[PDB]
């Protein structure tokens, strides 16, 4: 194989930037705040998987439910095919029955 003939540039991480310093604050907003807000409400992400977890087939179906009607034609077609592939895998294949 081949390896670099020079050392790559040093990578410097500032561990006291604002994002890292205050990471985690308000994770106990509920228990310490009279349960006004559940901590799951603080997650920033796709609408269909805020405060939710599942396997890919479940993830595929959940993406369709929330934004199935606002998706592009090609993206929706690929999602439908992705669901049908996963369905036959998880429900008809695998070592265990």
């Amino acid at each position: 194989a081949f390896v670099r003939l020079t050392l790559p540039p040093p990578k410097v991480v500032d561990r006291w930037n604002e994002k890292r310093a205050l990471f985690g604050v308000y994770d106990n907003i509920g228990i310490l705040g009279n349960f006004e807000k559940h901590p799951k409400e603080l997650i920033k992400g796709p609408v269909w998987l805020r405060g939710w977890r599942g396997n890919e087939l479940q993830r595929c179906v959940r993406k369709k439910k929330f934004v199935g009607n606002r998706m592009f034609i090609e993206d929706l077609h690929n999602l439908n095919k992705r669901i049908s592939y996963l369905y036959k895998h998880f429900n008809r294949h695998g070592k265990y029955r």
């Binding site: 390896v3 670099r4 003939l5 020079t6 050392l7 790559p8 990578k11």
Partner: protein, 47 residues
């Protein structure tokens, strides 16, 4: 162009051996090299 700094580092030492061994430098007295105090070494010689 792979990730990481370590693979380059191990190779940089491989380059070190290639250059030094192919073209060795002239010998230098042990005094010039690190970890030398004259008095302590003299004591050990007698002991």
């Amino acid at each position: 162009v792979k990730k990481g700094f370590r693979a380059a580092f191990r190779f940089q030492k491989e380059l070190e051996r290639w250059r030094l061994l192919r073209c060795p430098p002239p010998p230098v007295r042990r005094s010039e090299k690190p970890n030398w105090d004259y008095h302590a070494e003299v004591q050990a010689f007698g002991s």
